[PDB]
Design an enzyme around this catalytic site. Structure first.
Site, PDB file in Angstrom:
ATOM      1  N   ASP D  97       0.839  -1.191   0.000  1.00 25.24           N
ATOM      2  CA  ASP D  97       0.000   0.000   0.000  1.00 25.24           C
ATOM      3  C   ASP D  97       0.879   1.248   0.000  1.00 25.24           C
ATOM      4  O   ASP D  97       1.072   1.866  -1.043  1.00 25.24           O
ATOM      5  CB  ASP D  97      -0.973   0.000   1.186  1.00 25.24           C
ATOM      6  CG  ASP D  97      -0.303  -0.332   2.500  1.00 25.24           C
ATOM      7  OD1 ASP D  97       0.558  -1.232   2.516  1.00 25.24           O
ATOM      8  OD2 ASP D  97      -0.643   0.310   3.516  1.00 25.24           O
ATOM      9  N   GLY D  99       4.255   1.476   0.701  1.00 29.91           N
ATOM     10  CA  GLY D  99       5.497   1.193   0.011  1.00 29.91           C
ATOM     11  C   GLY D  99       6.706   1.681   0.784  1.00 29.91           C
ATOM     12  O   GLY D  99       7.836   1.571   0.311  1.00 29.91           O
ATOM     13  N   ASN D 100       6.467   2.226   1.973  1.00 32.04           N
ATOM     14  CA  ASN D 100       7.545   2.706   2.833  1.00 32.04           C
ATOM     15  C   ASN D 100       8.466   1.577   3.272  1.00 32.04           C
ATOM     16  O   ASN D 100       9.684   1.650   3.098  1.00 32.04           O
ATOM     17  CB  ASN D 100       6.977   3.411   4.067  1.00 32.04           C
ATOM     18  CG  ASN D 100       6.194   4.661   3.722  1.00 32.04           C
ATOM     19  OD1 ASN D 100       6.552   5.398   2.804  1.00 32.04           O
ATOM     20  ND2 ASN D 100       5.116   4.906   4.459  1.00 32.04           N
ATOM     21  N   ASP D 153      -3.569 -10.647   7.750  1.00 28.72           N
ATOM     22  CA  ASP D 153      -4.373 -10.746   8.963  1.00 28.72           C
ATOM     23  C   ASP D 153      -5.168  -9.490   9.302  1.00 28.72           C
ATOM     24  O   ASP D 153      -4.911  -8.406   8.779  1.00 28.72           O
ATOM     25  CB  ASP D 153      -3.477 -11.086  10.155  1.00 28.72           C
ATOM     26  CG  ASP D 153      -2.627  -9.910  10.597  1.00 28.72           C
ATOM     27  OD1 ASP D 153      -2.713  -9.525  11.782  1.00 28.72           O
ATOM     28  OD2 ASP D 153      -1.874  -9.370   9.759  1.00 28.72           O
ATOM     29  N   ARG D 159      -5.507 -15.426   8.810  1.00 27.62           N
ATOM     30  CA  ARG D 159      -4.309 -15.705   8.017  1.00 27.62           C
ATOM     31  C   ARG D 159      -4.450 -17.000   7.222  1.00 27.62           C
ATOM     32  O   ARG D 159      -3.879 -17.145   6.141  1.00 27.62           O
ATOM     33  CB  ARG D 159      -3.067 -15.795   8.906  1.00 27.62           C
ATOM     34  CG  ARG D 159      -2.554 -14.469   9.431  1.00 27.62           C
ATOM     35  CD  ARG D 159      -1.165 -14.628  10.029  1.00 27.62           C
ATOM     36  NE  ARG D 159      -0.773 -13.470  10.828  1.00 27.62           N
ATOM     37  CZ  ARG D 159      -0.138 -12.409  10.343  1.00 27.62           C
ATOM     38  NH1 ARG D 159       0.182 -12.355   9.057  1.00 27.62           N
ATOM     39  NH2 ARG D 159       0.177 -11.401  11.145  1.00 27.62           N
TER      40      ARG D 159
HETATM   41  O1  LIG Z   1      -5.676  -4.601   3.889  1.00 26.16           O
HETATM   42  C1  LIG Z   1      -4.553  -4.773   4.803  1.00 26.16           C
HETATM   43  N1  LIG Z   1      -4.592  -5.748   5.766  1.00 26.16           N
HETATM   44  C2  LIG Z   1      -3.496  -5.909   6.653  1.00 26.16           C
HETATM   45  N2  LIG Z   1      -2.400  -5.057   6.510  1.00 26.16           N
HETATM   46  C3  LIG Z   1      -2.384  -4.120   5.569  1.00 26.16           C
HETATM   47  C4  LIG Z   1      -3.458  -3.958   4.699  1.00 26.16           C
HETATM   48  N3  LIG Z   1      -3.106  -2.889   3.845  1.00 26.16           N
HETATM   49  C5  LIG Z   1      -1.857  -2.475   4.248  1.00 26.16           C
HETATM   50  N4  LIG Z   1      -1.518  -3.226   5.235  1.00 26.16           N
HETATM   51  C6  LIG Z   1      -0.260  -3.069   5.901  1.00 26.16           C
HETATM   52  C7  LIG Z   1       0.811  -3.942   5.200  1.00 26.16           C
HETATM   53  N5  LIG Z   1       2.120  -3.365   5.358  1.00 26.16           N
HETATM   54  C8  LIG Z   1       2.998  -4.304   6.060  1.00 26.16           C
HETATM   55  C9  LIG Z   1       2.691  -4.274   7.608  1.00 26.16           C
HETATM   56  C10 LIG Z   1       2.107  -5.644   8.057  1.00 26.16           C
HETATM   57  C11 LIG Z   1       1.438  -5.496   9.430  1.00 26.16           C
HETATM   58  P1  LIG Z   1       2.480  -6.355  10.736  1.00 26.16           P
HETATM   59  O2  LIG Z   1       1.889  -7.741  11.032  1.00 26.16           O
HETATM   60  O3  LIG Z   1       2.487  -5.514  12.020  1.00 26.16           O
HETATM   61  O4  LIG Z   1       3.899  -6.507  10.227  1.00 26.16           O
HETATM   62  C12 LIG Z   1       2.652  -3.075   4.082  1.00 26.16           C
HETATM   63  C13 LIG Z   1       4.074  -2.473   4.196  1.00 26.16           C
HETATM   64  P2  LIG Z   1       4.389  -1.314   2.786  1.00 26.16           P
HETATM   65  O5  LIG Z   1       4.556   0.081   3.330  1.00 26.16           O
HETATM   66  O6  LIG Z   1       5.634  -1.720   2.062  1.00 26.16           O
HETATM   67  O7  LIG Z   1       3.226  -1.336   1.815  1.00 26.16           O
END
Ligand SMILES: O=c1[nH]cnc2c1ncn2CCN(CCCCP(=O)(O)O)CCP(=O)(O)O
Ligand SMILES: O=c1[nH]cnc2c1ncn2CCN(CCCCP(=O)(O)O)CCP(=O)(O)O
Ligand SMILES: O=c1[nH]cnc2c1ncn2CCN(CCCCP(=O)(O)O)CCP(=O)(O)O
Ligand SMILES: O=c1[nH]cnc2c1ncn2CCN(CCCCP(=O)(O)O)CCP(=O)(O)O
Ligand SMILES: [Mg+2]
Ligand SMILES: [Mg+2]
Ligand SMILES: [Mg+2]
Ligand SMILES: [Mg+2]
Lengths: 169, 171, 169, 171
Positions: D97, D99-100, D153, D159
């Protein structure tokens, strides 16, 4: 190092066995009430975990940890979430001596989960130095050199959809 | 974080003298062991205490570190680098209040079956103890006050203080 | 493996040098305004970090990280806190080839701190494969086999209050 | 967490077919490389996608994983097990989303100087992109909705779903 790989357990046979494993696991934990979590031991069990958890018809969490490589069992990466008061099912690709799972189970037991069980895809009863209870086994095999389905040989063949045997030329 | 002031509770000189004493006690305990010895520090708060303590321990030993988390489960963020099996292990902590964390850390290390296992803490707040955990070496038993300095922080602050101070809010 | 240890840099000489290092570091960062943090590379720099940060008369944070053991530089343990927009001073026990610090500095630079500097207790100019900028050096020594003050030999002598030389018998 | 419902956005069959296609594209790209190849997955959300994708990649490669954190700094909670120097590296992510995170992860891996470096993501939410990061393989570009399933999740839930669904609150 010269070798080759023949199919020992075809993709379809694995899929059928995991389907049965999924039903067994579902049958035991569906009337628990407490939260459930499948813990995979990286990185040989990632493919098995993916297919297995999809065949488990019970709401559960998916977590991973990385243990050591006689030396002690060290934790390179611990679980991201807590397991206290939860039903924990350790998911491993293959068990031989049973040293690692024995220590891993002890470590996880200290966090006092409701229940603690182990599910393995492959089992080698021949090699066994520590008796550790295993409730779900996919296949019991003789002491063969197997690869595929997450199981590697010099960081190779991890991506094979089947369990294969390595033939040393 | 709120407006506060740091007043000295345990001066630098008092700490140096006490660690010197602790050193002699630890030395006398493991001098005739023969088996390998290792001091295990719990990051981050114990880095300064470890540095000064191991210099006062007059026996050949190893220095290792580990990082543990936190009602949550005690997780291992960073494990030891070396094996402790068949070794005299002395866990080095900066401060004990609840004793929850250290209790779990001792349990994990005990699974690896060391020859002996013991704990040395610099500070101790027994009026906050929730779990009975056996501590053999204690630098100072202190009253129930929020202390800072000597590795111990307040909002990641005052770790570099050469003495133990206490935070006093402005109300 | 048969050897012995002689004092090369006495405890008092180290203490005096760190006192001077503390004043230098204080002089450079006292009029910055931004937050400061000393980052130690485990586990050879823990004793140096302890003595040094006490001689730094500037409010700062203390963090640690563990790098790899030609292979790539991997991070076994990362920093606990953030360094973005902060003054970062990497604290190392000794630099030779300069491979590790070069990679570590690159990794840390990606997090965009205000400034990024390196402070080392010992420096071996002779062994050097990657030119990495070092602003604060405690001692420049020839390619000698040194131990003590956090520096080990087969996980030994880390606890020595002095820098000593190993004599192979 | 609030009361909600999960409705299917991308059925299991649609995912299997799309990953099969992705597999053929990845295979055709690195088949004549000769140099070692490694798929790097970002835990946890990418474990299921990785398992199915690497089975569709018809070239000899390695499978490795790493865990990154999060305006906070991207920290490495778990690094790779193997070296990527002089290797074709394909980062495997579940969803993009902002992309950071992925931008930073690519920067870190680039420091280790692989032969080539590329990204394969299953889902893509370009309406949330804050940083321009080059993605070469994309399974599905999806609308701005909170998706779950297939490794992804919602409060550590769903998941294990074999399909991609979307969470709809009850207001
Ligand atoms: O619909 C979504 N459903 C659950 N998550 C989402 C969604 N949309 C964007 N996220 C967050 C996912 N992001 C990763 C974080 C995962 C949450 P963690 O288990 O604390 O590591 C994307 C990192 P990016 O900045 O490269 O795009
Ligand atoms: O035929 C086999 N083929 C590839 N591996 C096998 C086989 N047989 C037993 N292994 C090693 C499996 N072991 C997992 C570790 C994998 C090696 P690593 O990835 O380098 O750490 C289980 C030992 P445990 O019972 O103590 O848990
Ligand atoms: O005055 C105090 N000042 C700063 N901390 C204190 C004090 N008092 C008790 N703490 C918390 C210290 N506890 C360790 C947690 C360190 C905080 P972290 O940086 O997030 O890891 C003791 C664990 P225990 O349960 O074994 O006693
Ligand atoms: O005389 C020496 N005595 C003990 N060590 C030395 C000496 N000389 C260079 N070393 C190794 C110091 N290196 C630190 C690693 C310590 C070995 P590890 O604890 O097993 O990982 C610095 C290499 P760098 O310049 O790439 O950062
Ligand atoms: Mg395994
Ligand atoms: Mg502590
Ligand atoms: Mg070093
Ligand atoms: Mg992800």
């Amino acid at each position: 190092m010269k070798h080759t790989v023949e199919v020992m357990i075809p993709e379809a046979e694995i899929k059928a066995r995991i389907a049965e494993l999924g039903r067994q696991i579902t049958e035991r934990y569906k009337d628990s009430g407490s939260d459930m979590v499948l813990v995979g031991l990286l990185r040989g069990s990632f493919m098995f975990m993916a297919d297995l958890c999809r065949e488990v018809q019970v709401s559960h969490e998916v977590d991973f940890m990385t243990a050591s490589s006689t030396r002690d069992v060290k934790i390179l990466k611990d679980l991201d979430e807590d397991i206290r008061g939860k039903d924990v099912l350790i998911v491993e690709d293959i068990i031989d001596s049973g040293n690692t799972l024995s220590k891993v189970r002890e470590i996880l037991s200290l966090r006092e989960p409701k229940s603690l069980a182990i599910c393995t895809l492959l089992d080698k009863p021949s090699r066994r130095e520590v008796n550790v209870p295993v409730e779900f086994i996919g296949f019991s095999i003789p002491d063969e050199f197997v690869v595929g389905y997450g199981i590697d040989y010099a960081q190779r063949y991890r991506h094979l959809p089947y369990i294969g045997k390595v033939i040393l030329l």
